Amino acid sequence: MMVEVSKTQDSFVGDGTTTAVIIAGGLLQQAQGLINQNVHPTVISEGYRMASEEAKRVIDEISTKIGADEKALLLKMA
Amino acid sequence: KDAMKENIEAAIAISNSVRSSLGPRGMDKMLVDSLGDIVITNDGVTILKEMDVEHPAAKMMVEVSKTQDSFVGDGTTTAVIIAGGLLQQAQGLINQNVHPTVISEGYRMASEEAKRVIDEISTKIGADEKALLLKMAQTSLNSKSASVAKDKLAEISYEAVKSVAELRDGKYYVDFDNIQVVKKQGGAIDDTQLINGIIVDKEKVHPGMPDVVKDAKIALLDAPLEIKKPEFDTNLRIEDPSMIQKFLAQEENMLREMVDKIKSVGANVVITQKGIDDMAQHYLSRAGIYAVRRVKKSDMDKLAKATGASIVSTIDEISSSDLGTAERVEQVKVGEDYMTFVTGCKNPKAVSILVRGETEHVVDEMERSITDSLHVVASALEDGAYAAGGGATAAEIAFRLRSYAQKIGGRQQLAIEKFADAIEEIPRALAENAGLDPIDILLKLRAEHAKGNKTYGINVFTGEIEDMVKNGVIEPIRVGKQAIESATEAAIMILRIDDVIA
Amino acid sequence: REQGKNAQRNNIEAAKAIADAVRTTLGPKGMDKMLVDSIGDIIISNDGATILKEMDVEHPTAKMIVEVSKAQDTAVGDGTTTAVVLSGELLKQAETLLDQGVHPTVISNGYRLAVNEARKIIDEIAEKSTDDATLRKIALTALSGKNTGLSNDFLADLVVKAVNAVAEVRDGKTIVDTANIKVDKKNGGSVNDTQFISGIVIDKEKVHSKMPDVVKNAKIALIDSALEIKKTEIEAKVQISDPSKIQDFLNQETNTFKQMVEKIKKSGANVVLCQKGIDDVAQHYLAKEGIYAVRRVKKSDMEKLAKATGAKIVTDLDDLTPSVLGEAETVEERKIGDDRMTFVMGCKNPKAVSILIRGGTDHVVSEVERALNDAIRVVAITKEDGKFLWGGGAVEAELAMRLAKYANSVGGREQLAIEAFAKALEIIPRTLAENAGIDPINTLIKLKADDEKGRISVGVDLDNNGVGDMKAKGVVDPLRVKTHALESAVEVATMILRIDDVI
Amino acid sequence: REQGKNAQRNNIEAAKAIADAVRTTLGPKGMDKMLVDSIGDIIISNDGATILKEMDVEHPTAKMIVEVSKAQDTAVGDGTTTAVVLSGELLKQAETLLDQGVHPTVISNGYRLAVNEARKIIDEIAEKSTDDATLRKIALTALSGKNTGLSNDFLADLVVKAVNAVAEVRDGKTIVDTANIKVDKKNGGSVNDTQFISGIVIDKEKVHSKMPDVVKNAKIALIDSALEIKKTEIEAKVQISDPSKIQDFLNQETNTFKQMVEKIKKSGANVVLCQKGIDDVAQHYLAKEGIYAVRRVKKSDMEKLAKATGAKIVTDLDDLTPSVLGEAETVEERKIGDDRMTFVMGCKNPKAVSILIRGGTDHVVSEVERALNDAIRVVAITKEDGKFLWGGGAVEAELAMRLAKYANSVGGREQLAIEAFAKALEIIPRTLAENAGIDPINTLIKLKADDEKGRISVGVDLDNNGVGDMKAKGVVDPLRVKTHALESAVEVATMILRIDDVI
Amino acid sequence: KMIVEVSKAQDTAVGDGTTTAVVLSGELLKQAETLLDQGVHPTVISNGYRLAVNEARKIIDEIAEKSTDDATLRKIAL
């Protein structure tokens, strides 16, 4: 199932499959703690869902439109 | 890396084996050794000393149990639960590349601060000594199956210690060698009683000895009553058929004279650690002497202190000054068996508790449960102060450690805060065991304590976070300081070991 | 190792099982079990404790339920089956409360409340009486599901009589030391031939043929030592340098035995009961003196005899003075069955009697003995307590009815717990019925109502084939047995209930 | 059997491995190892020698590297980890010179040159000082990577004090016989409760209850023999022909013990420390005489006690004259922990002290003892040598810098060899850093330059998180330890280097 | 295998309720085990369940709440 992550991240975007996996482990290792304190896996799943939503919002917020520097910007990305 | 990961887990495992027994909604364990011996108990020290642990880390966690047991007597399940916390927490910190030296210092510093706090939030036992101590005795009994009769057992625990407690420099001191605790099945729990004197589970050595002696002169021997064969190779040479009887008479005389000596010095009772020859038995019997034999050494000492006797190992020199004293010695049938009760001891600061239980394994736990109370009311009495139980003081120490962490800032701070979370293990366990929602109770617990409610704990019956000293759940301050002491010393040890080989 | 649910349900399952092993032995229409080992072999009994002590229990929990039978037995004598069956039922009933979510502890607290409460209701509804009329009743009932023949009335009577003959009174209360009643048995076929001896019987023969077949007005000397040649504790050797001495030394031996006998005669003793051996030469002269001697007498006996005849057990024959001799009108050897036994009658102290059990087979005598013991113990208790209860499911039915009412006057969870204890108590009536072959449920239904209408004494009437008046039938349960059964059961049930992890 | 390259590289591989087993225990931020056997069991330590003596080394070569820890330990006390790690590095560094074609011998000659040279530079750059101020510093550092708590300053002080209290001066120089410092331990939780006793402590109780709980101005008799009934070397037998004698012989025994006690009292001795046993009758009378006796005293102790109190160890009580009794202001039994121990204080000879170690667990006391020993040994050495070095990679960094320069002033092949020894020396700084969790390479790079600019005392500053001034932090390495470490390492490295065929 | 049969039926016949029907069959069999131990005959137990279920089959139809508006259809869905 964790590997299922890899292919999917690869599929949609193409760069960041190692990133996706690292986070999935984080989230799981963390839920491991919360689970010890009798926090219900439903609560953890909602919380995780809500955080995620907010996380994508943030990225949109802190993002930056590629201006006239398209060339060097894109080069820096490559 | 791995050696550590493995060690921490093995350790945490032992912790969990004991977690479910903490508190009033605690559960008990059944332990069956190789020989098929069964021990059904709640006493964490026993659960630990009993189980078959192999992993060295696990053995180290158990080392905790015995030590906490050794110094204080109540709180071994507590010590273990914390040692697991600290270890499980260090497990997190270790993932973030926090050096085990940092974690060990932080843990050390937090610990120090934790004991300070307990001293701070503690409370001197005032003139309410009686009910305060009673409340302590009971809380102890609350976790054990003895709860059934916590009211009576607590009074007995209170009565017994109060009796042998010497208040010297305005300070009390309790010598347990003045509290003889015996267990005899065949009676209900409620039947447990306090006997002023030292009861010995031994009956008279011969059918003809009296069942009772009043105003007894107790002669205590640590030698057997028998003919003494020389140290050199000795042999009797009989060349005349007449000598045969002369020799046999001489041997009987030697034994008949031992009895004479003990008798001549005014001895009325002869309690010996060793054996009594059958012929010597006749003599004592004939002299009207009540004599028991092969008595337990531990018991020997207790009879000594009680009667003010001296354990003579050289009968030939048994002096009158060596005789103990008691108002009366009597054989009484305690259910099935016959016991010897030395009542009205010369030294009144000696007493006995006769634990009654309908079944062997039942009376065994009953005996363990009471010893726990004794150690408590005693430890409390001596210390002079007590802290609020039910996780209140833990939640308190947890609270204060989060502050100190911000003061002694740095990576140290990460370790200090984890130490706080770990102490919080107690409230979690207490809640969990009852059925209360840990995270909810813990949150409410933090609130009140934040607001300076230093005594708000978990009333495991109502599920509410009430005043622990009010509702009466209190414990000697000594229990808390050691648990945190023993607990941090385990965590630090396991935490420095980066490799385990043979 | 088993944790939580596994452990618990498993534990309740264990107890339940061991409990059913004895269930069918309950009551009059009870059955017997046949346990067979490896050497001794076949043991056939109806006794609860026996079937279990001999049973090869392995499961820890089961071993604990067994513990209560051994306790019930040694502490109260009767009720071993009941206490086991009851522990099984309290653990079983709890398994429901457990599944619903109730915590083992509160269940343990309900059982406390319940039992403490029942421990009052019974003592409230207990029926006082100490007359032989009812002592006889306690007896008849204690001998029910057992294979004793048709002689029960005869046996009941022996028991009442033995108890009464040894019952002493002290500061106002009656005491019955069951130890003064010596029961023995001998294969000879009869069961009716069971003799009640107003004295002490010793399964021993006189050591030497020429000894008096009987001794009237006997001065009895009890001896701790063996009338044999003793050797000095310090190794000895005899050096004969003259041929003559070889005989002299052989004579010392003889003259030694002669004197032992002389000391004995000098005391006035004409009967010598020796806990140890007796040498053939000692025997020669004891016989020549006309003293009735018996060797290797059991210490247990040496003690009863000392108590019955008033003699002092002496080791050193030098301290064998007339002052320490016991008394008995007659000391006579008589052949009971194939065996010759020594009868000591007319003992100085009357509060010491025997019941020489007869019956045939062997397997029948052992059990009849086991039955007679339950009877002896309870008749004794009842003699002291002077109180008793209505047998055959009666007491239980009542307790159950009252306890279910007390339950309502209790909290939420604990109520559930005490209602559970109320049901557990109905296990007895149901059992007695089941064994009888009647309908449990209806029996219970009918029994409830009659007890509800106030008929305390309506028990399970196997004869009426259902319910009936135990008052009339005279089925009475002694108090002390009910209570220890109840208390024992609760303590052990609780113990097992708290075990959440067995390792 | 392995020949040439195989053998050699294999041998270097072995040494390297055993060497890494202890590598992580180096320095302050060190770790501990947990060795577990089959019975005794768990041993947790940071001590180099321990981790290895207990370790189950199989490979021959590895056994040789282990030999140096045991030597370093018994010969110089501190430095066991260093000598091992260093031998591993010299063998490792050589493996390169080997592959290039350099002959094992010339490599062995380079290491000679190098070490002989370093053995001068250090002695050149060594810093003299004998003041308690620095003795205290040697101590603090010797207790670093060890699990001793926060009490180190307290412990350092005990050590300085003990060393100073036993340090004697002879023909101008100070001598410190570490044997006069008796260290012991007792589980009682504290570590701060570690008492410094100005006398000798004996883990023993008085043999008899009635003996004085304490003895002031004591005349102490040390006894080699056991106060017991002795038997003649030539087999003896006692022939009793008269019954009377049986007692007389039993009395000789008593009167024997009475006299032993009498001889003792006659000497003036009021305290008897017996290396062997004491009979209960001897005890009776020693107690009656009021003499404080202790049995089965350890010979090791019998000896220290003899030295501390000035007593002569006597076997034949006939040669127990006042002339051979020792002196102590007080001999008192006191309960340390669960155990009762005998305190001998105010000994005739002051140059004899104890350190009664406390601490809890058990596993913590043993190690704290091990730590306190390293401290005691080095503080002692330093007291005598009066010289020391800059700790924490400092000395090494300097030696490495100078040696790489000396290398150029040497031949072709040998230069290569000495440059190799220069690098091997940098293994310590790198190690201290690695363990601390900092960056080896940069630490080294930075440390080199600072030492190069003349900053002798710049060591690896874990606090500053890199390099720093050891002068300030007070991290000082005793001379004798560095040198034996270096010399031991070179001798053993050479030994292994020449082995071209192992069979 | 028989209890499993009811989930497959519940599903293909009514769509929702497969868990319920299983859990319920488990409980009716479990509850019966007591009546069994007391002496009640399997058949009369089977007749009680008939009576009971036939009865409940009326109470519910009695207490059932009518409504076909999208408002509640949406509720059934959620």
Ligand SMILES: Nc1ncnc2c1ncn2[C@@H]1O[C@H](COP(=O)(O)OP(=O)(O)O)[C@@H](O)[C@H]1O
């Ligand atoms: N009546 C109570 N209400 C809430 N908590 C209680 C009560 N009685 C005891 N406790 C808590 O339960 C814990 C004691 O449980 P126990 O199983 O005896 O552990 P330990 O072995 O450490 O004494 C303590 O923290 C104590 O304060």
Ligand SMILES: Nc1ncnc2c1ncn2[C@@H]1O[C@H](COP(=O)(O)OP(=O)(O)O)[C@@H](O)[C@H]1O
């Ligand atoms: N004649 C009887 N009629 C009805 N019940 C009887 C009769 N005799 C005994 N019982 C009942 O059987 C139960 C005891 O059976 P028993 O075989 O003696 O076992 P236990 O070992 O428990 O005494 C009691 O409830 C008792 O009253």
Ligand SMILES: Nc1ncnc2c1ncn2[C@@H]1O[C@H](COP(=O)(O)OP(=O)(O)O)[C@@H](O)[C@H]1O
């Ligand atoms: N406080 C410190 N700061 C820096 N280095 C230290 C400190 N303490 C010890 N060291 C260094 O650690 C090395 C010795 O580590 P140690 O564990 O004692 O092993 P060894 O058995 O070789 O003495 C030495 O170079 C020493 O100077």
Ligand SMILES: [Mg+2]
């Ligand atoms: Mg407790």
Ligand SMILES: [Mg+2]
């Ligand atoms: Mg019966």
Ligand SMILES: [Mg+2]
């Ligand atoms: Mg060192």
